[PDB]
Amino acid sequence: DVEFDALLGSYCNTLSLVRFLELGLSVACVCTKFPELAYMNEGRVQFEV
Amino acid sequence: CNTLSLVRFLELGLSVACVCTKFPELAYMNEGRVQFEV
């Protein structure tokens, strides 16, 4: 008697690492680096017209 | 604590076209006459 229970398949999907500066909604925002924003109670912006 | 307190502006070009004539320099003046002959 000859018998075997065989293993035939294993597949992984790609996990797409999608950056924020790719999509079309990057246009409306100007993101910029500022550390220590946790330390302020106000860093808030004042503008003329 | 931030900038962007700036807007800019001007208005010319069409500001002479619709005006459709101009005399500058009115001095101390009392009466302006233009007569028509047709």
Précis, in short:
Chain A: It is found in: Virion; Host nucleus. The structure is cut from a larger assembly and holds two copies of chain A. The first copy, chain A, is largely without helices or strands and 49 residues long.
- In oligomeric terms, what are we looking at? part of a larger assembly
| Shape, per Cα inertia axes of chain A | elongated
Largest interface: A-B, 8 and 6 residues
Amount of helix of chain A: under 10%
The biggest sheet of chain A amounts to: none
What fraction of residues of chain A sit in β-strands?
under 5%
Computed over alpha carbons, the radius of gyration of chain A is: 26 Å
Amino- and carboxy-terminal Cα gap of chain A: 91 Å
Structural class of chain A: little secondary structure
Helical run tally of chain A:
0
Count the beta strands of chain A.
0
Family (chain B): Belongs to the herpesviridae major capsid protein family.
Subcellular location (chain B): Virion; Host nucleus
Protein name (chain B): Major capsid protein
Give an overview in words.
This is part of a larger assembly, with two copies of chain A. The first copy, chain A, has no helices and no strands. By secondary structure, the first copy, chain A, is mostly loops. Chains A and B meet through loops of A and loops of B. The PDB classes it as viral protein. Keywords: HSV2, viral protein. Structure of HSV2 viron capsid portal vertex. Chains A, B: Major capsid protein.
Topology:
The structure is cut from a larger assembly and holds 2 copies of chain A.
Chain A: no helix or strand
